[PDB]
């Protein structure tokens, strides 16, 4: 997944794009701060869980 | 003139190209950012290297 926050829909597009995923092991790559935002979003998505 | 001037206003700032590589960017941190530009335009110089 390649995504960036653009205008007012990055969250929509990112959320729609991230929601599909089901995989157990995730490699993440981004700036540290972006990691903060992506993780908040993952916590909402439920991707951080066990 | 054409756009609403009561609500918002437009002011213009611009710089002559500098031969030294450093001035174009340095022209930005103080020259192009001290003034708080909302956007920048850029064009090829008369002499091109």
């Amino acid at each position: 997944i390649h995504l960036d926050m653009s205008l007012d829909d990055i969250d929509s597009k990112i959320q729609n794009q991230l929601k599909k995923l089901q995989s157990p092991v995730i490699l993440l790559y981004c700036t540290k701060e972006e990691a903060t935002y992506i993780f908040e979003v993952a916590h909402s998505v439920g991707l951080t869980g066990y | 003139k054409r756009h609403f001037t009561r609500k918002i206003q437009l002011n213009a700032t611009s710089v002559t190209h500098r031969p030294n590589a450093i001035q174009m960017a340095l022209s930005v941190c103080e020259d192009l950012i001290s003034s708080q530009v909302y956007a920048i335009l850029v064009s090829h110089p008369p002499a091109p290297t």
């Binding site: 926050m5 653009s6 205008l7 007012d8 | 941190c29 103080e30 950012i33 001290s34 708080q36 530009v37 909302y38 956007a39």
Partner: protein, 49 residues
């Protein structure tokens, strides 16, 4: 027409932080609808081209 926008950082000095306002300016600017122009029709692709 958009709202709640913070001014850009004043001066390079002392600011290690990005500016929340600005990406949005790009978004509206890419979606501008003033097709009439001397140069020709204006619309912007995803890359901003």
């Amino acid at each position: 027409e958009m709202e709640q926008i913070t001014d850009p950082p004043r001066g390079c000095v002392g600011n290690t932080n990005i500016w929340k306002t600005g990406p949005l300016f790009k978004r509206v600017l890419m979606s501008s609808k003033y097709p009439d122009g001397v140069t020709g029709r204006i619309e912007f692709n995803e890359d901003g081209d």
